[PDB]
Amino acid sequence: QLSEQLAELEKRSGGRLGVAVLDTATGRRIAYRGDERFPMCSTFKALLAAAVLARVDQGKERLDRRITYGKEDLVDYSPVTEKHVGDGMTVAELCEAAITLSDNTAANLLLEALGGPAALTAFLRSIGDEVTRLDRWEPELNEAAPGDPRDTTTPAAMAATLRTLLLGDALSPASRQQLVDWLVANKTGDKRLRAGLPADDRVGDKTGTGGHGTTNDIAVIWPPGRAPIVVTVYLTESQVDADARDAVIAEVGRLVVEAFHHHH
């Protein structure tokens, strides 16, 4: 029934909607266009931070390492990094900025430290994701052109990847907890999935926004006394404006909650 509801929601959006819901109590999932490719936009930054933490786990990186950069490195929408050109930022501060405020320069600096989009893709292949790929840097990766496989995931692949990073064994337990803490502290998602969820739910999420009417949100949700649920939402080619697209994702959140509380 949830699929039916999502198809109706997709129709009124004028675009293409992809959703996966993964219940970690059972490992079972529900998906709508779960195996279709969608542009990630900034949702990749959750994966970037995971790859950085994997390097920390391996003794190849430190969260307190200082990264220095100049004004020449700044790209558009860099609300945190534009303030620290003089003093630089630590790897941890960059991860925090990339995840919780979607800072673009922070993501590029971390990509540089990691070894680039191919290194991120290689990390994803190493944990079992054969689908997700990063190809470009900020801000170009947000093009979101239909039919372009660059910088894409699928809702199901992303949900499984979040599950193994945040709840599985891909990262050390300390690194897993750190990644959770960053996502739970996200500041950019109040009008998206979070807007459709009960107040007593603990939520970590990462948003994305791009060209071709693209609005995304990926989340892990901890309902009270319950195993967490992973929800990925990708909306692209949508004809409605940015605020309306936010409301589409909020409605996915509401529909998912309804499905888990009334056996849909």
- Please give the positions annotated as active site: 42
- How many whole angstroms separate alpha carbon 224 and alpha carbon 126? 33
CA atoms within 13 A on the CB side of 158: 40
Strands (E), 107-162: 152-153
Q: Is 228 helix (H, G, I), strand (E, B) or coil?
A: coil
- How many whole angstroms separate alpha carbon 155 and alpha carbon 129? 12
Tokens of 116: 């680039």
**Sign of the Cα pseudo-torsion (22, 16, 189, 114, in order):** positive
Contact between residue 172 and residue 63 where contact means Cβ atoms under 8 Å apart: no
Nearest CA among 8, 12, 57, 18 for reference residue 233: 18
